[PDB]
């Protein structure tokens, strides 16, 4: 009676409405609009600091909300809280398993997440009493490697995993409150909205999904890329986000009238993007690459406004402070640079 | 403004207590020689063994310490998390080597070696390759139950190399089969040369007592070719 091939045919009818709905609202392109504004000019940054001390390659970093401290996680099995004004060190924390793939700094400055190929997120209470740092909760529910994690407050943390699921956790009870399903491919990154009611997530199918944190569903689905997505980040006002992927492109998507708006590509670039990030105003866009460079694009004109070329191996991570004063990059040569 | 100079000197001594522990941690990271053990799954850790996600077993040969990691509880999409293992010394690859009756488990092992060897980030990592699970009569040519001329259309037109060392008493046509499977590898190895890594084959059996020695004697060759390349000699 053939149930499978008419359910697979109804989805073709349902998808052709969504493509024709987005086509009906495409009254102009973005480069038709912004072709009258003045350019940004060439920019340059000069590597104000350099932070040495890791034994193996660096996979992640995260600034603090006070724009001074930062975390860094490396495959030798360490986790360092640097101070960026004076290049000192606080709290080199040793890990239980060495393959860590992500880290996060809580907005209260009280905890530090990490996780990796051991399928476990860890909490590491910093502002402690009667002792040094210690692991606190050790969340464990996933069946694949842990690829990202971000704090909401000191009791909720949303994690991304390699078993195609996102999840929302409850510290001090340990089990997960909400479990997000729907991807087909390893979820590689995430980013929260500035009001923290929603978050986006891109995976190894060429797709990105908007999720409701409080509800537990998926609102929209964005498909314009061609390979695995490795990075994502929101715009400052929260009404847009930009992705980076293996097809040497970055793209800009708006939430309302779900389609893409801009594509950041160049003919000399044949390498994949490992990180994206925005400036404070949202005019620049800073992407790391696999050919050891770090370009800078104009988010309203799709031009290229500069380059940052200081590392020896590929750039894994990237991040701009909340006041917008500096950019930190990290790479597989185990050094971090601060550019300004 | 000397009120700044109170606590930042305590910050300054908090920097030197950290650096003293990192000196003790560099000394044991620099002398531990990580290895990654991956196979098709059937042989696995039956051979490479000294008598949750990552499993972590360590051992010691000649007062030199090692690490071996078997990957478990992960999915079968390997294009990520395989590039977390690029600064290891070697990748111990285990092949069942008796795949004629369960499928074609032998051809699937060849496609995986072609993806690992040519990857991008694994271009500098040498592979120690064990051809496990001999079974010279059972499911092989000493009994003639299954034919390898039908699974590979060659090997009916192939002869044994000039210098093949048999065991005294070993079947003249099982040594023709044992060296053909090894020669399906080493032509994926000896084609591309821009990576500068190697491939080292071996034959393991049921009695593999010496099998921590052949991995010791060849991780010594891997470090030797790294230091010789520093002087532009290779």
């Amino acid at each position, epitope marked *: 009676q053939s149930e499978l091939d008419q359910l*697979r045919q109804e989805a073709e009818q349902l998808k052709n409405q969504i493509r024709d709905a987005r086509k009906a609202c495409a009254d102009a392109t973005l480069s038709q609009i912004t072709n009258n504004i003045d350019p940004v000019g060439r920019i340059q940054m000069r590597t104000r600091r350099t932070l040495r001390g890791h034994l193996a390659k660096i996979y992640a970093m995260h600034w603090g909300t006070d724009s001074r401290l930062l975390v860094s996680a490396s495959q030798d099995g360490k986790l360092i809280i640097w101070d960026s004004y004076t290049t000192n060190k606080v709290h080199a924390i040793p890990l239980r398993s060495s393959w860590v793939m992500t880290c996060a700094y809580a907005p209260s400055g009280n905890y530090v997440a990490c996780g990796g190929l051991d399928n476990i997120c860890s909490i590491y209470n910093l502002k402690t009493r009667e002792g040094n740092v210690r692991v606190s909760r050790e969340l464990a529910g996933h069946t694949g490697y842990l690829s990202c994690c971000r704090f909401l407050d000191d009791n909720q943390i949303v994690t991304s995993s390699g078993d195609t699921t996102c999840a929302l956790w409850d510290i001090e009870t340990g089990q997960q409150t909400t479990t997000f399903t729907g991807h087909t491919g390893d979820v590689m990154s995430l980013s929260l909205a500035p009001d923290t009611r929603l978050f986006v997530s891109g995976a190894c199918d060429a797709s990105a999904k908007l999720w409701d944190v409080r509800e537990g569903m998926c609102r929209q689905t964005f498909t314009g890329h061609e390979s695995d997505i490795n990075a994502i980040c929101f715009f400052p006002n929260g009404n847009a986000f930009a992705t980076g992927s293996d097809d040497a492109t970055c793209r800009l998507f708006d939430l309302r009238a779900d389609q893409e708006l801009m594509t950041y590509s160049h003919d000399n670039i044949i390498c994949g993007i490992t990180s994206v990030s925005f400036s404070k105003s949202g005019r620049l866009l800073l992407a790391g690459y696999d050919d050891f460079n770090c370009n800078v694009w104009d988010a309203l004109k799709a031009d290229r406004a500069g380059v940052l070329a200081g590392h020896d191996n590929r750039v894994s991570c990237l991040g701009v402070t909340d006041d917008g004063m500096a950019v930190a990059t990290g790479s597989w040569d185990s050094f971090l640079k601060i550019w300004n | 403004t000397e009120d700044q100079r109170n606590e930042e000197k305590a910050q300054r001594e908090a920097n030197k207590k950290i650096e003293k522990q990192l000196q003790k941690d560099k000394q044991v990271y620099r002398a531990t020689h990580r290895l990654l053990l991956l196979g098709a799954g059937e042989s696995g850790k039956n051979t490479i063994v000294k008598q949750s996600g990552i499993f972590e077993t360590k051992f010691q040969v000649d007062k030199v310490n090692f690490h071996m990691f078997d990957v478990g509880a992960q999915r079968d999409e*390997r294009r990520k998390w395989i590039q977390c293992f690029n600064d290891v010394t070697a990748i111990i690859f285990v092949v069942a080597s008796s795949s004629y009756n369960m499928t074609n488990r032998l051809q699937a092992a060849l496609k995986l070696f072609d993806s690992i060897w040519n990857n991008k980030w694994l271009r500098d990592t040498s592979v120690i390759l064990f051809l496990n699970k001999q079974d010279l009569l059972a499911e092989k040519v000493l009994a003639g139950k299954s034919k390898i001329e039908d*699974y590979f259309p060659e090997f009916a037109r192939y002869t044994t190399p000039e210098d093949a060392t048999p065991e005294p008493g070993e079947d003249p046509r099982v040594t023709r089969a044992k060296y053909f499977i090894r020669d399906e590898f080493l032509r994926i190895s000896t084609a591309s040369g821009d990576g500068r890594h190697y491939c080292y084959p071996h034959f393991t059996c049921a009695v593999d007592t010496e099998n921590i020695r052949r991995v010791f004697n060849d991780c010594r060759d891997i470090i030797q070719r790294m230091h010789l390349r520093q002087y532009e000699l290779l």
Partner: nanobody
Amino acid sequence: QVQLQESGGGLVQPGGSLRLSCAASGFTFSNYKMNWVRQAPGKGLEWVSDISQSGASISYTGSVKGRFTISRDNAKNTLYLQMNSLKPEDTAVYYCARCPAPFTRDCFDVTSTTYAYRGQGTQVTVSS
């Protein structure tokens, strides 16, 4: 939306012939190298052939070595597979899979269950 729609497969007598096809859309066809995989009932997915970027660098498996042939046409985003002298071992559904990244020579997750860049497949049957 990356999509790959195979067509042109059905039942035939042994010793006969059949030519499959695939129309690819959603990406630049010239940068990726393609594959063909199959799944006999009760076994699992296995690899059949591949072909590089516009190249005459073609690989086959040992079972269908002397009688199968592949061909791509980059001008129309199409991938073919001409099959001849079919045997009852060739009773499987055949998918068209591409490599995950452009301009590469490794190709990892083709013969994997739950793989993204792969069609739904076409049935090919032989019977006497």
